[PDB]
């Protein structure tokens, strides 16, 4: 249980750090970005999942 | 904090200062464009 | 070398050396401890 909880929590932090830098760069980006609302939609939907996952796996570890 | 979240104790002691960095970030961006 | 990079780096360096001093006020000499 803890095996999945901390992984999903550590990945949530790492993903966020990518999103924190990635999202504003992708927006202010002239060319190069049909490329990237996929990855915006990628991380976003994946971010919400991890939040719920860690939120659910919280009651099983504490 | 719960013992399961004792991992991010150094991270927690940093988070409150983050909003202030946004005020400083505005000056970086403005310096980057040369204060138009 | 862009000036805004120089000013930012120097600026961050200023904050660090100052934060060390306020740190020093709570540890070692002048800590009242």
């Amino acid at each position: 249980m803890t095996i999945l909880f901390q992984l999903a929590l550590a990945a949530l932090v790492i993903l966020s750090f990518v999103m924190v830098i990635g999202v504003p760069v992708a927006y202010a980006s002239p060319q190069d970005w049909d490329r990237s609302k996929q990855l915006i939609f990628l991380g976003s939907g994946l971010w919400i999942a991890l939040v719920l996952v860690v939120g659910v796996l919280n009651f099983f570890v504490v | 904090l719960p013992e399961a979240y004792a991992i991010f104790d150094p991270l927690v002691d940093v988070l409150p200062v983050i909003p202030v960095l946004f005020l400083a970030l505005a000056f970086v961006w403005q310096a980057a464009v040369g204060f138009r | 070398i862009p000036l805004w990079i120089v000013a930012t780096v120097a600026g961050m360096g200023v904050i660090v050396i100052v934060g060390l001093f306020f740190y020093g006020a709570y540890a070692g000499l002048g800590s009242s401890l």
Binding site: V20, I21, V25 | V14, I18, W29, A32 | I5
Partner: peptide, 29 residues
């Protein structure tokens, strides 16, 4: 103990890095 200092490092540089990336990419700054 200096994990302290590692956090403010990545977090603190996260801001200016975006500006640097948008500069070399010549983005909408």
């Amino acid at each position: 103990v200096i994990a302290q200092l590692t956090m403010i490092a990545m977090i603190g540089i996260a801001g200016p890095m975006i500006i640097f990336l948008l500069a070399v990419r010549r983005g909408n700054l």
